[PDB]
Amino acid sequence: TSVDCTAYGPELRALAARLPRTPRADLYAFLDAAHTAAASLPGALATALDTFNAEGSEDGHLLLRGLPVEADADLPTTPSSTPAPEDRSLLTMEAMLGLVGRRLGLHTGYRELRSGTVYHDVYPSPGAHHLSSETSETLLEFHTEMAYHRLQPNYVMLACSRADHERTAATLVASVRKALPLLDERTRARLLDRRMPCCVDVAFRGIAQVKPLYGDADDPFLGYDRELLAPEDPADKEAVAALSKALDEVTEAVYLEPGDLLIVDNFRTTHARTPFSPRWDGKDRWLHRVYIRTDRNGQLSGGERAGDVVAFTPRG
Ligand SMILES: CC(=O)N[C@@H](CCCNC(=N)N)C(=O)O
Ligand SMILES: O=C(O)CCC(=O)C(=O)O
Ligand SMILES: [Fe+2]
């Protein structure tokens, strides 16, 4: 689902201006400022975000296009390392992630991942591990983010400061609401609420059980990872292969361009990124990623604040 935010440019640049300019130096204060400012998002934008937050969508994602972003010459050189300097000045797309993210829920860091940071730069790196968001020339296959984590976030948000030079990297999304009707009853029934073994991302290494479909049988949530989900039982493997095929069959593509902020419903979709060739010239593709927790399905137990970092516990 898309929303052209071009008309909101001046108002959004004003809200971004309310925020502290060095976010990481006091991230709790920065996200608190963003929450207060989010109450002033232009009405139509706020309504769209709240509706998506409460109901999701059939296609599983809300793409905000045309948000303010610096001219390319005014952005820093694309980062070459992580984590980012705590003193880094606020970038406009990061301000958008603060405002939009707080309208939805609570930004969350994961202790073992990216040094426990909350804002992650997503750029290509040479010799990237194949499961890494730093990949470029190899397809980053479909995954629900951290499907195996008890504190898996409801949303993954990706804001774009630079697209890759040739604009070939496509962010793919497949929605359970479009895939489900393609599955027969036997398959849906085998998958629903059935725990299956699942490996974890490199950062969390050193076993999990994931239900590929779960919750209300007429509108289930989805936990799928093409690389990590590892059913052993043949009936389970067969049901997961049918799910895998249906997700491919309903794949949708978003080509992120500067000023875009894509909100992925991480309990109802799986996402991926197609190949692209980095130039290592200082202008490589550069997204900003944050994870947002909401009141749904046990993400929060009380007292959480946007900016908190949580430890790893596998679903079981
Ligand atoms: C949470 C996390 O580690 N995510 C990875 C990217 C997803 C890895 N792919 C699969 N899980 N199949 C990253 O490098 O950011
Ligand atoms: O590069 C992309 O478009 C998405 C990468 C991704 O899966 C992620 O950052 O979680
Ligand atoms: Fe991802």
Coordinates of C-alpha atoms and ligand atoms in Angstrom, one line a residue:
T1 CA 0.0 0.0 0.0
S2 CA 1.6 3.4 -0.9
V3 CA 1.1 7.0 0.3
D4 CA 2.6 9.9 -1.6
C5 CA 3.9 12.2 1.1
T6 CA 5.2 14.9 -1.2
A7 CA 2.6 17.5 -0.1
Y8 CA 3.7 17.0 3.5
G9 CA 7.4 18.0 2.9
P10 CA 7.4 21.4 4.6
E11 CA 5.4 20.1 7.6
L12 CA 7.6 17.0 8.0
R13 CA 10.8 19.0 7.7
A14 CA 9.5 21.2 10.5
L15 CA 8.7 18.2 12.7
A16 CA 12.2 16.8 12.0
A17 CA 13.5 20.1 13.2
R18 CA 11.9 19.7 16.6
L19 CA 14.2 16.7 17.3
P20 CA 17.5 16.5 19.1
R21 CA 20.3 16.7 16.4
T22 CA 22.6 14.0 17.8
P23 CA 20.2 11.1 18.4
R24 CA 22.4 8.5 19.7
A25 CA 23.9 10.7 22.4
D26 CA 20.5 10.4 24.3
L27 CA 18.4 8.0 22.3
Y28 CA 15.6 7.8 24.9
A29 CA 15.2 11.6 24.9
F30 CA 15.4 11.7 21.1
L31 CA 12.6 9.0 20.7
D32 CA 10.5 10.7 23.4
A33 CA 10.8 14.0 21.4
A34 CA 9.8 12.0 18.3
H35 CA 6.8 10.6 20.0
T36 CA 5.5 14.0 21.1
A37 CA 6.1 15.3 17.5
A38 CA 4.4 12.3 16.0
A39 CA 1.1 13.4 17.5
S40 CA 1.4 16.3 15.0
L41 CA 1.9 14.3 11.8
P42 CA -0.4 15.7 9.0
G43 CA -3.9 14.2 9.6
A44 CA -4.1 12.0 6.5
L45 CA -0.7 10.6 7.1
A46 CA -1.4 9.8 10.7
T47 CA -4.7 8.1 9.8
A48 CA -2.9 5.9 7.2
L49 CA -0.3 4.9 9.7
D50 CA -2.8 4.2 12.5
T51 CA -5.0 2.1 10.1
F52 CA -2.0 0.1 8.9
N53 CA -0.9 -0.4 12.5
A54 CA -4.3 -1.7 13.6
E55 CA -5.4 -3.7 10.6
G56 CA -2.2 -4.3 8.5
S57 CA -3.1 -4.6 4.8
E58 CA -3.6 -7.3 2.2
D59 CA -0.2 -6.7 0.8
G60 CA 1.6 -6.5 4.1
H61 CA 3.5 -3.2 3.8
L62 CA 3.0 0.5 3.8
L63 CA 5.3 2.5 1.6
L64 CA 5.6 6.2 2.3
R65 CA 7.1 7.8 -0.8
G66 CA 8.4 11.3 -1.3
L67 CA 9.3 12.1 2.3
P68 CA 11.9 14.8 2.7
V69 CA 15.5 13.6 2.3
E70 CA 18.7 15.6 1.9
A71 CA 20.1 16.3 -1.5
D72 CA 22.6 13.6 -2.3
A73 CA 25.5 16.1 -2.1
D74 CA 24.4 17.0 1.4
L75 CA 24.4 13.5 2.8
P76 CA 27.6 12.0 4.3
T77 CA 29.6 9.5 2.4
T78 CA 27.8 6.1 2.5
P79 CA 29.1 4.5 5.7
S80 CA 31.8 1.8 5.4
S81 CA 31.4 0.4 8.9
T82 CA 29.1 -0.3 11.8
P83 CA 28.1 0.7 14.4
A84 CA 27.7 4.3 13.6
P85 CA 29.4 7.1 15.6
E86 CA 27.3 8.1 18.6
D87 CA 27.9 11.7 17.6
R88 CA 26.6 11.4 14.1
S89 CA 24.2 14.2 13.2
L90 CA 20.6 13.5 12.6
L91 CA 19.8 12.6 9.0
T92 CA 16.3 13.5 7.7
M93 CA 15.4 9.9 6.9
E94 CA 16.4 9.0 10.4
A95 CA 14.1 11.7 11.7
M96 CA 11.3 10.2 9.6
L97 CA 11.9 6.8 11.2
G98 CA 11.7 8.5 14.6
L99 CA 8.4 10.2 13.9
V100 CA 6.7 7.3 11.9
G101 CA 8.2 4.7 14.1
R102 CA 6.9 6.3 17.4
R103 CA 3.5 6.8 15.7
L104 CA 3.5 2.9 15.5
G105 CA 5.3 1.7 18.6
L106 CA 8.6 1.3 20.3
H107 CA 12.0 1.3 18.6
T108 CA 13.9 -1.8 19.8
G109 CA 17.5 -2.9 19.7
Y110 CA 18.7 -6.5 20.0
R111 CA 21.7 -6.9 22.2
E112 CA 23.6 -9.4 20.1
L113 CA 22.8 -7.7 16.9
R114 CA 24.8 -4.7 15.5
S115 CA 26.2 -4.0 18.9
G116 CA 22.8 -3.5 20.4
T117 CA 22.1 -0.4 18.4
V118 CA 18.7 0.8 17.4
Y119 CA 19.3 2.6 14.1
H120 CA 21.1 0.4 11.6
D121 CA 22.8 1.6 8.4
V122 CA 22.2 -1.0 5.6
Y123 CA 24.9 -0.7 2.9
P124 CA 26.9 -3.2 1.0
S125 CA 30.2 -4.5 2.2
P126 CA 32.8 -6.6 0.4
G127 CA 32.9 -10.3 1.3
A128 CA 29.6 -10.0 3.1
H129 CA 28.2 -13.2 4.7
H130 CA 25.4 -14.6 2.5
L131 CA 22.7 -14.1 5.2
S132 CA 23.8 -10.5 5.7
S133 CA 22.0 -7.3 4.9
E134 CA 25.5 -6.2 3.6
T135 CA 25.1 -8.5 0.6
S136 CA 24.7 -7.1 -2.8
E137 CA 25.6 -9.4 -5.7
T138 CA 23.9 -12.4 -4.1
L139 CA 20.1 -12.5 -3.5
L140 CA 19.1 -12.0 0.1
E141 CA 16.4 -14.6 0.3
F142 CA 12.9 -14.4 1.9
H143 CA 12.9 -14.0 5.6
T144 CA 10.5 -12.8 8.3
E145 CA 12.9 -10.9 10.5
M146 CA 13.9 -12.7 13.7
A147 CA 11.0 -15.1 13.4
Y148 CA 12.8 -17.3 15.9
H149 CA 13.1 -14.6 18.6
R150 CA 10.5 -14.4 21.3
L151 CA 10.8 -10.6 21.1
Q152 CA 10.5 -10.5 17.3
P153 CA 9.4 -7.0 16.3
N154 CA 6.0 -6.3 14.7
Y155 CA 7.6 -4.0 12.1
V156 CA 10.8 -3.7 10.2
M157 CA 11.1 -0.1 8.8
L158 CA 13.6 0.7 6.0
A159 CA 14.2 4.3 5.0
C160 CA 16.2 5.1 1.9
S161 CA 18.9 7.9 1.8
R162 CA 20.6 6.5 -1.4
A163 CA 19.4 3.8 -3.8
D164 CA 22.1 1.7 -5.6
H165 CA 23.5 3.5 -8.7
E166 CA 21.6 1.5 -11.3
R167 CA 18.4 1.2 -9.1
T168 CA 18.4 -2.6 -9.5
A169 CA 18.1 -3.7 -5.9
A170 CA 14.4 -4.5 -5.3
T171 CA 13.0 -5.1 -1.9
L172 CA 10.6 -8.0 -2.2
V173 CA 7.7 -8.6 0.1
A174 CA 5.3 -11.6 0.2
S175 CA 2.1 -11.3 2.3
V176 CA 0.4 -14.2 4.1
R177 CA -2.9 -12.6 3.3
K178 CA -2.3 -13.1 -0.5
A179 CA -0.4 -16.5 -0.1
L180 CA -2.9 -18.2 2.1
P181 CA -5.8 -18.7 -0.3
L182 CA -3.4 -20.5 -2.6
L183 CA -2.9 -23.2 0.0
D184 CA -5.2 -26.2 0.3
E185 CA -6.9 -26.9 3.6
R186 CA -4.7 -29.8 4.6
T187 CA -1.6 -27.6 4.2
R188 CA -3.0 -24.7 6.1
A189 CA -4.0 -27.0 8.9
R190 CA -0.6 -28.7 9.1
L191 CA 1.2 -25.3 9.3
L192 CA -1.1 -23.6 11.7
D193 CA 0.3 -23.4 15.3
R194 CA 2.7 -26.2 14.5
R195 CA 6.2 -25.7 16.0
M196 CA 9.1 -26.5 13.5
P197 CA 12.8 -26.3 14.1
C198 CA 14.4 -23.0 13.1
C199 CA 18.0 -21.9 13.1
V200 CA 18.9 -18.3 14.2
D201 CA 20.8 -15.5 12.4
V202 CA 24.6 -15.4 12.8
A203 CA 24.4 -12.6 15.4
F204 CA 22.4 -14.9 17.8
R205 CA 24.6 -17.9 17.5
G206 CA 26.2 -19.3 20.6
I207 CA 17.6 -23.9 18.9
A208 CA 14.2 -22.3 18.2
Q209 CA 10.7 -23.5 17.3
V210 CA 8.8 -21.4 14.9
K211 CA 5.1 -21.8 14.0
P212 CA 5.0 -20.9 10.2
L213 CA 1.3 -19.9 10.5
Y214 CA -0.2 -18.9 13.8
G215 CA -3.2 -17.2 15.5
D216 CA -6.6 -16.8 14.0
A217 CA -7.1 -19.5 11.4
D218 CA -9.0 -17.2 9.0
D219 CA -6.3 -14.5 9.2
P220 CA -3.1 -16.1 10.5
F221 CA 0.2 -14.5 11.2
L222 CA 3.3 -15.8 9.3
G223 CA 6.8 -16.9 10.4
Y224 CA 8.9 -17.9 7.4
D225 CA 12.6 -18.0 6.7
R226 CA 13.8 -19.7 3.4
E227 CA 17.3 -20.2 4.9
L228 CA 16.7 -20.9 8.5
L229 CA 13.4 -22.7 8.9
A230 CA 14.2 -26.4 9.0
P231 CA 11.3 -28.8 9.2
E232 CA 12.4 -32.5 9.5
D233 CA 9.1 -34.4 9.4
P234 CA 8.2 -35.0 5.8
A235 CA 4.6 -33.8 6.1
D236 CA 6.0 -30.6 7.6
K237 CA 8.6 -30.2 4.8
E238 CA 5.9 -30.6 2.3
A239 CA 3.6 -28.1 3.9
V240 CA 6.5 -25.5 4.2
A241 CA 7.4 -26.1 0.5
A242 CA 3.8 -25.3 -0.5
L243 CA 3.9 -22.2 1.6
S244 CA 7.2 -21.2 0.1
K245 CA 5.8 -21.6 -3.5
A246 CA 2.7 -19.5 -2.7
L247 CA 4.9 -16.7 -1.1
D248 CA 6.9 -16.6 -4.4
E249 CA 3.7 -16.5 -6.3
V250 CA 2.5 -13.4 -4.6
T251 CA 5.8 -11.6 -4.5
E252 CA 5.6 -7.8 -4.8
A253 CA 8.6 -5.5 -5.4
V254 CA 9.5 -2.1 -4.1
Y255 CA 12.4 -0.2 -5.5
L256 CA 13.4 2.0 -2.7
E257 CA 14.5 5.5 -3.8
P258 CA 15.6 8.4 -1.6
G259 CA 12.8 9.7 0.5
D260 CA 11.0 6.3 0.7
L261 CA 10.2 4.7 4.0
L262 CA 8.9 1.1 3.8
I263 CA 7.0 -0.3 6.7
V264 CA 7.0 -4.1 6.6
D265 CA 4.3 -6.0 8.7
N266 CA 6.8 -8.5 10.1
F267 CA 4.1 -10.7 11.5
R268 CA 2.4 -11.1 8.1
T269 CA 5.1 -11.0 5.5
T270 CA 8.5 -12.2 4.6
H271 CA 11.0 -9.9 2.6
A272 CA 14.1 -10.2 0.5
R273 CA 16.4 -8.1 -1.6
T274 CA 17.6 -8.7 -5.2
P275 CA 21.1 -8.4 -6.5
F276 CA 23.0 -5.2 -7.2
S277 CA 26.6 -4.3 -7.9
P278 CA 28.3 -1.9 -5.5
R279 CA 30.9 0.6 -6.8
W280 CA 32.6 1.3 -3.4
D281 CA 32.7 5.0 -4.4
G282 CA 31.1 6.6 -1.4
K283 CA 27.7 6.7 -3.0
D284 CA 26.6 3.1 -2.6
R285 CA 23.0 2.2 -1.6
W286 CA 22.2 3.3 2.0
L287 CA 19.1 2.5 3.9
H288 CA 18.3 3.1 7.6
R289 CA 16.6 0.2 9.5
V290 CA 14.7 0.2 12.7
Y291 CA 12.6 -2.4 14.5
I292 CA 9.3 -1.5 16.1
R293 CA 7.5 -3.3 18.8
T294 CA 3.7 -3.0 19.5
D295 CA 1.1 -4.3 21.9
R296 CA 0.5 -7.4 19.8
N297 CA 1.2 -11.0 20.6
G298 CA 3.6 -10.8 23.6
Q299 CA 6.3 -8.4 22.4
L300 CA 5.9 -6.3 25.5
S301 CA 5.6 -7.3 29.2
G302 CA 5.6 -3.8 30.8
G303 CA 7.8 -0.8 31.3
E304 CA 9.4 -0.8 27.9
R305 CA 10.6 2.4 26.3
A306 CA 11.4 3.2 22.7
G307 CA 15.2 2.8 22.6
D308 CA 15.4 -0.3 24.9
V309 CA 17.7 -3.1 23.9
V310 CA 16.5 -6.7 24.6
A311 CA 18.3 -9.9 25.0
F312 CA 17.9 -13.0 23.0
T313 CA 15.4 -15.8 23.9
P314 CA 14.4 -18.3 21.3
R315 CA 10.8 -19.2 20.7
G316 CA 10.0 -22.6 21.9
Ligands
LIG1 C1 18.3 -10.1 12.2 C2 19.3 -10.3 11.1 O1 20.5 -10.7 11.5 N1 19.1 -10.1 9.8 C3 20.1 -10.2 8.8 C4 19.4 -10.2 7.4 C5 18.4 -11.4 7.2 C6 19.3 -12.8 7.2 N2 18.6 -13.7 6.3 C7 17.8 -14.7 6.9 N3 17.6 -14.7 8.2 N4 17.4 -15.7 6.1 C8 21.0 -9.0 8.8 O2 22.2 -9.2 8.4 O3 20.6 -7.9 9.3
LIG2 O1 18.2 -4.2 1.4 C1 17.0 -4.3 1.6 O2 16.1 -3.8 0.9 C2 16.4 -5.1 2.8 C3 17.5 -5.8 3.6 C4 16.8 -6.5 4.8 O3 16.3 -7.6 4.7 C5 16.8 -5.9 6.1 O4 17.5 -4.8 6.3 O5 16.2 -6.5 7.0
FE3 FE 15.5 -8.3 6.7

